[PDB]
Design a protein around this ligand. Structure first.
Ligand SMILES: *Cc1c(COP(=O)(O)O)cnc(C)c1O
Length: 228
């Protein structure tokens, strides 16, 4: 049956979502890109609209909010967890079967906890794709790595034979408030050179996604421009 929704809202949200997709695509041609639809704090009905339209990759920031939404909505959604990740919440997150991606690995202890919890609670699911989150701000932020030695230790773990239930996909930055995107591109260059990787970048939100695309992102993460 699905979550019931208003048709004027349906028409409006579909229109906004298509308008963004068209711009992502036109920027990408002048230079696919993943358009991650960020639905954090938006109602399950709004997700249902876009799901019915054909969208599958949705980004959420709060652990309990994601777990409940995942139960309410179809199981072939690919959820991305893109908010603050606490070591003591990896077990709850690793229980969601269709947890497709976590983009906020910012410590070795978190990577290790997530791998272990996933081995424990959903061994038979596809490994969670992970981005390592970097503080590109050159200031001091609550989240994101900045020390080269500690970033390399995290990548090293992900490439080890022990890291079986999560898989290194890329790097992620929320940036700052484009030199942030240039510094994540430089981190990709160093990491790729040292370890043999070819990391995907996740950078670009509603205010700055056009620049992100222009500087080589593989994924932009858009909330406000779509759900408006
Ligand atoms: C909220 C959020 C987004 C979307 O931000 P908008 O300005 O609404 O497009 C993208 N990435 C992360 C990590 C976020 O928390």
């Amino acid at each position: 049956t699905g979550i019931t929704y208003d048709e004027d809202r349906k028409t409006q949200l579909i229109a906004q979502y298509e308008s963004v997709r068209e711009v992502v695509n036109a920027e990408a041609k002048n230079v696919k890109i993943l358009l991650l639809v960020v639905s954090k704090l938006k109602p399950a009905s709004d997700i249902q609209i876009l799901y019915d339209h054909g969208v599958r990759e949705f980004g959420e920031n709060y652990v309990q909010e994601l777990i409940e939404k995942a139960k309410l909505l179809p199981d072939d959604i690919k959820w991305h967890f893109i908010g603050g990740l606490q070591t003591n919440k990896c077990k709850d997150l690793a229980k969601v079967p269709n947890l497709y991606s976590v983009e906020t690995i910012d410590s070795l202890k978190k990577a290790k906890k997530l791998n272990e919890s996933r081995a424990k609670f959903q061994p038979d699911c596809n490994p969670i794709l992970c981005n390592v989150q970097i503080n590109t701000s050159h200031e001091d932020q609550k989240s994101g790595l900045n020390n080269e030695a500690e970033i390399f230790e995290v990548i090293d773990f992900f490439l080890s034979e022990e890291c079986k239930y999560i898989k290194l996909n890329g790097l992620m930055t929320i940036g700052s408030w484009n030199r942030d995107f240039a510094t994540l591109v430089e981190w990709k260059k160093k990491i790729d050179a040292k370890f043999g990787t070819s990391l995907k970048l996740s950078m670009g939100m509603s205010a700055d996604f056009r620049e992100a695309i222009r500087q080589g992102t593989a994924e932009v993460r858009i909330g406000t421009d779509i759900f408006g």
